[PDB]
Amino acid sequence: KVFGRCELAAAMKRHGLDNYRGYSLGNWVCAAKFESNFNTQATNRNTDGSTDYGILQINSRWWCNDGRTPGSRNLCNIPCSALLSSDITASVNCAKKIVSDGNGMNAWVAWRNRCKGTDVQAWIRGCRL
């Protein structure tokens, strides 16, 4: 599913991401925009053999099992395919674990490079939240 910007903001808010570990909603919407262009079915292969999955491009090296990443850790306890669903619940629950790990949202390279320190409130502007 390809989310609309405000539709996604509303689903993220409902799943408890607004101000989760101090990151306002706009940060999460911005990260999703640049990670996956709001497409729950986005996959991207990394040079190390791991793959990133879903709306927040969560990586198979640490976070999910895809059966093809030798020595992967599966910290979210979830098949990576579950992260591609039109229901964002699995992605949200896993992202909460990731952002709690010590490095906050810096774990998402596009958030670091494209969202961090920008006016992220613009991403929720005009939305009925």
Ligand SMILES: [Pt+4]
């Ligand atoms: Pt469809």
Ligand SMILES: [Pt+4]
């Ligand atoms: Pt909804």
